Design a binder for this molecule. Sequence first.
Ligand SMILES: Nc1nc2c(c(=O)[nH]1)N(C=O)[C@@H](CNc1ccc(C(=O)N[C@@H](CCC(=O)O)C(=O)O)cc1)CN2
Ligand SMILES: O=c1ccn([C@H]2C[C@H](O)[C@@H](COP(=O)(O)O)O2)c(=O)[nH]1
Lengths: 315, 278
Amino acid sequence: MEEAYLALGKKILEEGHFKEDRTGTGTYSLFGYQMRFDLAKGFPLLTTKRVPFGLIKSELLWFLKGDTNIRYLLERNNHIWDEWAFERYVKSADYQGPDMTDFGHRVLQDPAFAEQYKEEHQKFCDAILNDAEFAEKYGELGNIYGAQWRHWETKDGSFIDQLANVIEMIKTNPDSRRLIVSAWNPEDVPSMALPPCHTMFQFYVNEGKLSCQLYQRSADVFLGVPFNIASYALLTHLIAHETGLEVGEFVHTLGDAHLYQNHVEQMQEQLSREVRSFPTLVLNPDKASVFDFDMEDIKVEGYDPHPTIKAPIAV
Amino acid sequence: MEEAYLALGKKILEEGHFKEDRTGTGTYSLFGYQMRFDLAKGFPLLTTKRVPFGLIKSELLWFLKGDTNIRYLLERNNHIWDEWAFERYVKCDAILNFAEKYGELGNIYGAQWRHWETKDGSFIDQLANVIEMIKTNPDSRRLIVSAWNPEDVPSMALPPCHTMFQFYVNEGKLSCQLYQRSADVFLGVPFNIASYALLTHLIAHETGLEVGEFVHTLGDAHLYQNHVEQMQEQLSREVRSFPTLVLNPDKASVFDFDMEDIKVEGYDPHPTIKAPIA
Ligand SMILES: Nc1nc2c(c(=O)[nH]1)N(C=O)[C@@H](CNc1ccc(C(=O)N[C@@H](CCC(=O)O)C(=O)O)cc1)CN2
Ligand SMILES: O=c1ccn([C@H]2C[C@H](O)[C@@H](COP(=O)(O)O)O2)c(=O)[nH]1
């Protein structure tokens, strides 16, 4: 239920202590929490603010195809992963523009700086889309989600298709208590742009229904959790479709649950608004595998949220 | 609190749906559960039945030291591996007094925690690294130890039940959350609570911190159908205060702790309740 996500934000505002963080922004933080969404009551795309479903769709199809380079995302006008690739490029020996140290805070404080950032980010997006060599080197985020889900590398010259394996297991061993996918690969963590926020997840079958639990080590509550929720709920529906099952519950478990301190006014404005009905998900019935779905095969119908509430991403 | 454990038992007896399992025994199960233990309130070794802290501590020190050979356990009267290692051989004093040959137990917690193999043939020490990160960078959201390698899982007889755990530091207190994919709620969960609360206290000791909370997250939480009468007996008994953990103050590093260095004071449980392993 949406009220479950809104009660987490209110608990952080009330009693989550201040914790300095890697980004330099500052957060209010709790440790250890659990929410549940019954997917039979509606698709959990939040209605108390507008959440863009097409960016959640394109990000998950990107994961599912095993891709860890942002060119696919830019082709679909999805810029949610741009920051970390831009930071990689401004730190390299090839960047020749104005200094971009600490650009993620500087843009909020200094209009002259903000215009130079906007200029350099444009030139970056154009180069990824138009120069294949530039994209191959500077679009690359390392072995994040797509690579661990489809291509966990072995010590003997091969790779494990972890996500296709677990879908198969659901079909022939549905009571198995080892239906797990992990993106936590210790050997690859240091070279990933960021280590996986949404860390490992497990499926469960009973009485013809599929359920999924996620363990999320680090949750940005205002900007990232509404995307996370909707992404794992879509993944659970696609798998249920291929395996011929009905949908059960998504259980979301958090580690460090944090509100960044420059999202507090946004959270308070969200908390003032009346919840509406969740929308319904519609999937193309003639697609058989999760891997065959494309953008036009997936939609939400009946979505009528309250207005967008903008907030800055912590880099 | 102990009541939060007993509440999980009672919920599965009332609402757990019937669900078949690997062993062919019946179970009543729920998916997704979370319990909190505030370690300032007492050390969570259950009072409503006796739980053997001796086997928990020899097993936990064995893993911490990255040891994987049973000699260590046998010396400390923990037999939870005896038959298997003999069965390996058939294909016990000599282990104590041949041990290097017939006494090794491969791909288990100690090795994944302190010797995770990489593609080039070197090894990551996850637990040493996380201790050093607690000391230098306590606000880190990446304080993670994983036991789950998909390259290894398909060939082992029991893939890890304790798939990964995470630490957290605030106001000078250390907390730990465990993700446990599969929980036998009568027999395994009481042992599991104590193990991971003890690990939270040993790490807080090594890092100069006080204790916060142990948060226990469950995937498939199940009562075996032949443990129902035992759970019902336990639920009829009055809860008592948890005992107090005492660690040896005169030893800096826990990597030099042994059995005599870890004690529980004030433990006053109701009697042992017997049941079968599935
Ligand atoms: N700080 C932070 N970094 C992170 C995450 C996170 O949740 N928080 N992620 C966690 O998985 C990944 C990125 N996910 C993101 C999700 C949403 C938006 C975002 O800015 N949403 C805005 C604007 C959307 C739009 O472009 O229209 C919004 O929802 O209003 C950014 C990154 C990697 N890095
Ligand atoms: O420390 C332990 C070890 C084992 N189990 C139980 C959980 C399951 O009943 C069984 C393992 O069976 P699978 O989940 O792998 O089927 O052992 C625990 O609860 N805790």
